[PDB]
Amino acid sequence: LGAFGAGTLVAFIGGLIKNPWKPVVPTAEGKKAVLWTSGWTPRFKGETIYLARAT
Amino acid sequence: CSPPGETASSEPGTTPAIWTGSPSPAAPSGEDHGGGHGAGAAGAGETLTAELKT
Numbered sequence: 124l125g126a127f128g129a130g131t132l133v134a135f136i137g138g139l140i141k142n143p144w145k146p147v148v149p150t151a152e153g154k155k156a157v158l159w160t161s162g163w164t165p166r167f168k169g170e171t172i173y174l175a176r177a178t
Numbered sequence: 179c180s181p182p183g184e185t186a187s188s189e190p191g192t193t194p195a196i197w198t199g200s201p202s203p204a205a206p207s208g209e210d211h212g213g214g215h216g217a218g219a220a221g222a223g224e225t226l227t228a229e230l231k232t
């Protein structure tokens with residue numbers, strides 16, 4: 124019963140569990156985690172990111 | 179507690195230099211090209227201007 128409950132709970136919750144620190148967002152310094160990177164992170168070295176006003 | 183990194187009284191700074199962006203190596207596989215033409219020479223393309231002065 125303990126093993127079955129362990130397996131079932133883990134299989135129930137592992138779908139939800141995700142790594143926050145999986146490098147996914149590309150960056151000039153290689154793929155990085157989402158929290159480190161924002162829209163201002165240069166995708167490639169020397170990229171121009173204008174401070175565009177949102178009309 | 180205060181955050182480890184704060185405050186800088188010295189080193190007033192400098193005016194940022196004029197930004198000179200670089201062509202995208204990642205987004206563009208190669209170099210973006212403008213006018214298209216046969217250009218049976220070293221290469222001139224489909225864009226050629228000139229200003230005739232006095």
Ligand SMILES: CCCCCCCCCCCCCCCC(=O)O[C@H](COC(=O)CCCCCCC[C@@H](C)CCCCCCCCC)COP(=O)(O)O[C@H]1[C@H](O)[C@H](O)[C@H](O)[C@@H](O)[C@@H]1O
Pocket residue numbers: 128129132133134136137138139140141142145
């Ligand atoms: C007694 C059980 C002992 C085992 C505990 C297991 C929990 C520790 C994990 C150990 C292996 C970790 C390394 C290998 C695995 C790894 O690399 O994955 C990581 C995340 O660990 C997972 O996988 C899923 C975690 C499993 C759920 C754990 C639930 C908590 C346990 C402690 C509570 C139930 C146990 C019974 C006790 C309570 C009794 C009740 C009275 C990161 O995710 P990621 O790299 O983004 O890929 C994503 C894919 O994983 C993800 O499934 C998928 O959803 C995608 O979204 C994907 O993004």
